Amino acid sequence: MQKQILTSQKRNMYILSRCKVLVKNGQVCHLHEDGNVYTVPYANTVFIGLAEGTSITNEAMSMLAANGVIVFWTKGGGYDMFAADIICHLPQADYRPTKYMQNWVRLWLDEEKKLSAAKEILKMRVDSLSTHVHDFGVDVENKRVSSIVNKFDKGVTQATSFESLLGHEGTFVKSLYKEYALEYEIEFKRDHKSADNYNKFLTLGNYYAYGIARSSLWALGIDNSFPLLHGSTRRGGLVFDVADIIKTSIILPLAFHAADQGMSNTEFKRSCVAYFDKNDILAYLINNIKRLCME
């Protein structure tokens, strides 16, 4: 149905499902499933999303883009977007890359800001862990998890190279995997090819994390070819680097809870998008990328 997502401060990423978007009486509306029309205010939204069962028309597209309301096509849920155009400074007056994009590029270029931003993305990944506290998952304030957190903090702060950061990131990620395996009474080893519940649930949750990180990178105009940790030849490595922030804080406890209770995949999708809507995870990633790129 109609879904609101706060992204930066005031603009809202509207998600529209099972509706036909067109122009009625000179302004953009949409007929919904229940046969009731709903209009959209141009002032409070910049991102508008078209989920499953949704069609838009040409003059609705044109009038939405002329009002600064830039449209994207997404899979139902609002965090699995497959089609959009690039954010500019203004949609009609000029065509310039966003300040965030340019800042990211400059930071990526000079080697020192790239190393500092790699350290910072891991700092905010540890922050994400504490910030987004779950109920079924392990305690972030537990002594073993806090020891893993301080080990990662020491290792990131004392490192001067990227391959050290990759080893430390892998140690932290799989150490949280080991901690959640110690919670849920299983021998868990992370492999994509396994058909067990924990590994495949973590895989499709990671794909959801890639989708929401892709939406967060798109919404500030950040391109998908400037990874911090991963190599220059890794296709879409920045999506993986941004999704790393919430892979071990949100996706991992939800996936282990989902494999523990053993429910099906669509209701895990609704749990993931419910956690994304409730705690504003996309807005957290948007502010994370602003604080990374602004420096």
Partner: protein, 165 residues
């Protein structure tokens, strides 16, 4: 019955089962198994497993047992108390070997040593291949191996976490 988990971690320098046995000994010596707390192990295939699971009916909290296992905290992990409608309860099975029963034949029937060897010469010598733990016994000053196997659930438990009768 609600239950709690005690999983042995980082015990590679020392075998996992030595830490498991020391967890059993420290749970015995500082109370815990009064008559109602019992143990079970999710991973007995050929080893005793690395998870101790306590399924007390009244409820085991994290604080009392983490104060109890303050000595194993370097390589232990305690999960939050979960619930289970059925736990797979184990009991103690013991072995006898020759001289054991010979001394019994000294003190029960009152026969001499040579005839006690005579009645038991071609008999005895059973060999338990069940998964086990290695226990320090404190009241009787020697260390032994205790064998555990699956049996029907009993209301009362020993001081070790196994079924009675």
């Amino acid at each position: 019955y609600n239950t709690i988990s005690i999983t042995v971690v980082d015990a590679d320098d020392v075998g996992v089962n030595f830490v498991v046995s020391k967890v059993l000994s420290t749970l015995h010596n500082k109370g815990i198994f009064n008559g109602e707390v019992g143990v079970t192990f999710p991973r007995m295939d050929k080893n005793v497993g690395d998870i101790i699971t306590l399924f007390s009916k009244t409820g085991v909290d994290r604080k009392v047992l983490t104060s109890t296992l303050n000595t194993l905290t370097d390589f232990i992990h305690i999960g939050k108390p979960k619930e289970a409608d059925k736990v797979k309860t184990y009991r103690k099975v013991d072995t006898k070997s020759k001289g054991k029963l010979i001394r019994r034949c000294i003190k029960r029937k009152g026969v001499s040593a040579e005839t006690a060897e005579s009645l038991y010469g071609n008999y005895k010598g059973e060999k338990c291949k069940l998964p086990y733990i290695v226990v320090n016994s404190k009241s009787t000053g020697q260390r032994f191996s205790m064998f555990l196997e699956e049996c029907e659930n009993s209301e009362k438990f020993n001081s070790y976490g196994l079924c009675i009768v």
